[PDB]
Amino acid sequence: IVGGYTCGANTVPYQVSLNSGYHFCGGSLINSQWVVSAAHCYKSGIQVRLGEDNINVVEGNEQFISASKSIVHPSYNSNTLNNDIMLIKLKSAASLNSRVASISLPTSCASAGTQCLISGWGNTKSSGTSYPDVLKCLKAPILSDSSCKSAYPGQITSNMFCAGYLEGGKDSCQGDSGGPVVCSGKLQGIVSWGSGCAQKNKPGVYTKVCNYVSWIKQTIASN
Ligand SMILES: N=C(N)c1ccc(/C=N/OCC(=O)O)cc1
Ligand SMILES: [Ca+2]
């Protein structure tokens, strides 16, 4: 997260870190057994880390649970990043409490102008590289589809939206991938892609979760 703020320990209780010996992606806990992330975060041997603030220090509220299975969206295209969404099932159910909590799926899509909270342990620099150890947060508006398409000609599908600031300076970044965009207590987006980070006229692009609710529910119901 570039140009954000320190969230505060366990203030974003649905935020997970995906770990394969090291943090590599974010995710969002959607019930005691399931995490939503980006398909481009797919790999084998994932351990889901819940209740994290400092990802490098055991602070007392963590739950580390290995993934039993991952399900990449059936129509995920890694070239275009269309349908950049994946479900991860935990080998055992997380213990839910104030600091480890699921986030609601949307019942309707959010609109341009809605303010959302974007979070992660990604790069905090728009030119250099600096990885924070504690969770970072950014409040950002969803942008209009027209401005999103104008920013990224020929690249924005109906399964994507832009959020952030056309002026630059405030954005998600590398390492935030798969993490949440939450708007009025609903998971509306997943950190997917963008040109660099926090660049002028290059806002963050996010997987449009409201498109996938049917698939998420049906998948969970049978796996
Ligand atoms: N909002 C952005 N500008 C943005 C967001 C996410 C990415 C994803 N990079 O994938 C590599 C990785 O996470 O390891 C790029 C740009
Ligand atoms: Ca920790």
Coordinates of C-alpha atoms and ligand atoms in Angstrom, one line a residue:
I1 CA 0.0 0.0 0.0
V2 CA 1.4 3.4 -1.1
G3 CA 0.3 6.6 0.6
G4 CA -1.8 4.8 3.2
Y5 CA -1.7 4.5 6.9
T6 CA -0.9 2.0 9.6
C7 CA -4.3 0.1 10.2
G8 CA -3.7 -0.8 13.8
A9 CA -3.3 -4.4 15.0
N10 CA -6.3 -6.6 14.2
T11 CA -8.5 -3.7 13.0
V12 CA -9.0 -5.5 9.7
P13 CA -10.0 -8.9 11.1
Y14 CA -10.9 -10.5 7.7
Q15 CA -7.5 -9.7 6.3
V16 CA -5.3 -12.8 5.8
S17 CA -1.7 -13.3 4.7
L18 CA -1.0 -16.2 2.3
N19 CA 2.4 -17.7 3.3
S20 CA 4.6 -20.2 1.4
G21 CA 7.7 -19.7 3.7
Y22 CA 7.2 -15.9 3.4
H23 CA 4.2 -13.6 2.8
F24 CA 3.3 -13.5 -0.9
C25 CA -0.4 -12.4 -1.2
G26 CA -3.3 -11.1 0.8
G27 CA -6.8 -12.7 1.0
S28 CA -10.2 -12.2 2.7
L29 CA -11.8 -14.6 5.2
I30 CA -15.4 -15.2 4.1
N31 CA -16.3 -17.9 6.6
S32 CA -14.6 -20.1 9.1
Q33 CA -13.2 -22.4 6.4
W34 CA -12.8 -20.3 3.2
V35 CA -10.6 -17.5 1.9
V36 CA -11.1 -15.4 -1.3
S37 CA -8.0 -14.3 -3.0
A38 CA -6.7 -13.5 -6.6
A39 CA -6.2 -16.3 -9.0
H40 CA -2.8 -14.8 -9.9
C41 CA -1.9 -15.7 -6.3
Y42 CA -2.3 -19.4 -7.0
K43 CA 0.4 -21.7 -5.8
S44 CA 0.7 -25.1 -4.0
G45 CA 1.7 -25.4 -0.3
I46 CA -0.2 -22.4 0.9
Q47 CA -0.5 -21.6 4.7
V48 CA -3.2 -19.1 5.6
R49 CA -2.2 -16.7 8.3
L50 CA -5.1 -15.1 10.2
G51 CA -5.0 -12.5 13.0
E52 CA -1.7 -11.0 11.7
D53 CA -0.5 -7.5 12.3
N54 CA 3.3 -7.7 12.2
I55 CA 3.9 -10.6 9.7
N56 CA 7.4 -11.0 11.1
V57 CA 6.6 -11.2 14.8
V58 CA 4.3 -13.6 16.7
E59 CA 2.2 -11.2 18.7
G60 CA -0.5 -13.5 20.2
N61 CA -3.6 -13.4 18.0
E62 CA -2.4 -15.5 15.0
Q63 CA -4.0 -18.6 13.6
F64 CA -1.8 -20.5 11.1
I65 CA -3.9 -23.0 9.1
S66 CA -2.7 -24.9 6.0
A67 CA -4.9 -24.8 2.9
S68 CA -6.5 -28.2 2.0
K69 CA -7.5 -27.0 -1.5
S70 CA -7.5 -24.1 -3.9
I71 CA -10.0 -23.4 -6.6
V72 CA -9.1 -21.0 -9.3
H73 CA -12.0 -19.5 -11.2
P74 CA -13.0 -21.7 -14.1
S75 CA -12.6 -18.8 -16.6
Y76 CA -9.4 -17.2 -15.2
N77 CA -7.2 -15.8 -17.9
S78 CA -3.7 -15.2 -16.6
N79 CA -2.8 -13.0 -19.7
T80 CA -5.7 -10.5 -19.4
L81 CA -6.3 -11.2 -15.6
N82 CA -10.0 -11.5 -16.5
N83 CA -11.8 -13.5 -13.6
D84 CA -8.8 -12.9 -11.2
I85 CA -10.4 -14.8 -8.3
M86 CA -9.7 -17.9 -6.4
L87 CA -11.1 -19.7 -3.3
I88 CA -8.9 -21.4 -0.7
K89 CA -10.2 -23.9 1.8
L90 CA -8.6 -24.2 5.2
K91 CA -7.7 -27.7 6.5
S92 CA -9.4 -26.8 9.8
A93 CA -12.0 -24.1 10.6
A94 CA -10.6 -20.8 12.0
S95 CA -11.7 -19.9 15.5
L96 CA -13.8 -16.7 14.9
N97 CA -13.5 -13.9 17.4
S98 CA -13.2 -10.0 17.4
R99 CA -9.8 -10.1 15.8
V100 CA -10.4 -13.0 13.3
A101 CA -13.7 -12.5 11.6
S102 CA -15.3 -13.1 8.2
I103 CA -16.3 -10.4 5.8
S104 CA -19.8 -10.4 4.1
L105 CA -20.2 -11.0 0.4
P106 CA -22.1 -8.3 -1.4
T107 CA -25.7 -8.6 -2.3
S108 CA -25.3 -5.9 -5.0
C109 CA -22.4 -4.3 -6.8
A110 CA -21.0 -1.0 -5.4
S111 CA -21.1 2.2 -7.4
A112 CA -18.5 4.7 -8.5
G113 CA -17.9 7.1 -5.7
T114 CA -18.4 4.6 -2.9
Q115 CA -15.5 4.8 -0.4
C116 CA -13.7 1.6 0.3
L117 CA -11.0 0.3 2.6
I118 CA -8.0 -1.4 0.8
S119 CA -5.4 -3.2 2.9
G120 CA -2.2 -5.3 2.7
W121 CA 1.5 -5.9 3.5
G122 CA 2.6 -4.8 0.0
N123 CA 5.3 -2.3 -1.2
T124 CA 4.8 1.2 0.3
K125 CA 6.9 3.0 -2.3
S126 CA 5.8 4.1 -5.8
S127 CA 9.4 4.1 -7.2
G128 CA 11.6 2.2 -4.7
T129 CA 10.9 -0.9 -2.6
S130 CA 10.0 -0.9 1.0
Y131 CA 7.9 -3.7 2.6
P132 CA 6.1 -2.8 5.9
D133 CA 5.9 -5.4 8.5
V134 CA 2.6 -4.2 9.9
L135 CA -0.7 -4.1 8.0
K136 CA -1.3 -0.9 5.9
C137 CA -4.7 0.6 5.0
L138 CA -6.0 3.0 2.3
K139 CA -9.4 4.6 2.0
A140 CA -10.2 5.1 -1.7
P141 CA -13.2 5.7 -3.9
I142 CA -14.4 3.4 -6.6
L143 CA -13.9 5.2 -10.0
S144 CA -16.3 5.3 -12.9
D145 CA -16.1 2.6 -15.5
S146 CA -15.6 5.2 -18.2
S147 CA -12.6 6.7 -16.4
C148 CA -11.2 3.2 -15.6
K149 CA -11.5 2.3 -19.3
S150 CA -9.9 5.6 -20.4
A151 CA -7.0 4.9 -18.0
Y152 CA -6.4 1.4 -19.4
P153 CA -7.7 1.3 -23.0
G154 CA -8.6 -2.2 -24.2
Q155 CA -7.9 -3.9 -20.8
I156 CA -10.9 -3.3 -18.5
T157 CA -13.5 -6.1 -18.6
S158 CA -16.9 -6.3 -17.0
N159 CA -15.2 -8.2 -14.1
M160 CA -12.9 -5.4 -13.1
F161 CA -13.2 -1.9 -11.6
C162 CA -10.8 0.9 -10.8
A163 CA -10.4 2.4 -7.4
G164 CA -8.0 5.1 -6.1
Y165 CA -6.8 8.5 -7.2
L166 CA -6.0 9.6 -10.8
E167 CA -3.6 12.2 -9.3
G168 CA -1.4 9.3 -8.1
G169 CA 0.4 8.9 -4.8
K170 CA -2.2 6.5 -3.1
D171 CA -2.7 2.9 -4.4
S172 CA -2.3 -0.7 -3.6
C173 CA 0.9 -2.3 -4.9
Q174 CA 3.0 -5.5 -5.3
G175 CA 2.4 -7.7 -2.3
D176 CA -1.1 -6.5 -1.8
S177 CA -2.4 -8.9 -4.5
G178 CA -5.4 -11.0 -3.5
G179 CA -6.3 -8.7 -0.6
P180 CA -9.6 -7.0 0.2
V181 CA -11.4 -3.9 -1.1
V182 CA -14.3 -3.6 1.5
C183 CA -17.1 -1.0 1.0
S184 CA -19.8 -0.5 3.6
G185 CA -18.8 -3.8 5.3
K186 CA -19.0 -5.9 2.1
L187 CA -16.2 -7.4 0.1
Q188 CA -16.5 -5.7 -3.3
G189 CA -13.0 -6.1 -4.7
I190 CA -9.8 -8.1 -4.7
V191 CA -6.4 -6.4 -5.4
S192 CA -5.6 -7.6 -8.9
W193 CA -3.4 -5.3 -11.1
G194 CA -2.2 -1.9 -12.3
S195 CA 0.6 -0.1 -14.1
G196 CA 3.3 0.4 -11.5
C197 CA 1.8 1.7 -8.2
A198 CA 0.4 5.1 -7.3
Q199 CA 1.2 6.4 -10.8
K200 CA -0.7 9.4 -12.3
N201 CA -3.7 8.3 -14.4
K202 CA -3.0 4.6 -13.5
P203 CA -5.3 3.7 -10.6
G204 CA -5.5 0.2 -9.1
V205 CA -7.6 -2.4 -10.9
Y206 CA -9.7 -4.8 -8.8
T207 CA -11.7 -8.0 -9.3
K208 CA -15.4 -7.2 -9.2
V209 CA -16.5 -9.6 -6.5
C210 CA -20.3 -9.0 -6.9
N211 CA -20.0 -10.8 -10.2
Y212 CA -18.8 -14.0 -8.5
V213 CA -21.2 -14.4 -5.5
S214 CA -23.2 -17.2 -7.2
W215 CA -20.0 -19.1 -8.1
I216 CA -18.5 -18.5 -4.6
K217 CA -21.7 -19.8 -2.8
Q218 CA -22.2 -22.8 -5.1
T219 CA -18.5 -23.7 -4.9
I220 CA -18.4 -23.5 -1.1
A221 CA -21.7 -25.5 -0.9
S222 CA -20.1 -28.5 -2.7
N223 CA -16.4 -28.5 -1.5
Ligands
LIG1 N1 -2.9 -1.2 -7.6 C1 -1.8 -1.4 -8.3 N2 -1.2 -0.5 -8.9 C2 -1.3 -2.8 -8.4 C3 -1.9 -3.8 -7.7 C4 -1.4 -5.1 -7.7 C5 -0.3 -5.4 -8.6 C6 0.1 -6.8 -8.6 N3 1.3 -7.2 -8.7 O1 1.6 -8.5 -8.8 C7 2.8 -9.0 -8.3 C8 2.8 -9.3 -6.8 O2 1.8 -8.9 -6.0 O3 3.6 -10.0 -6.3 C9 0.2 -4.5 -9.3 C10 -0.2 -3.1 -9.3
CA2 CA 2.4 -11.8 13.6

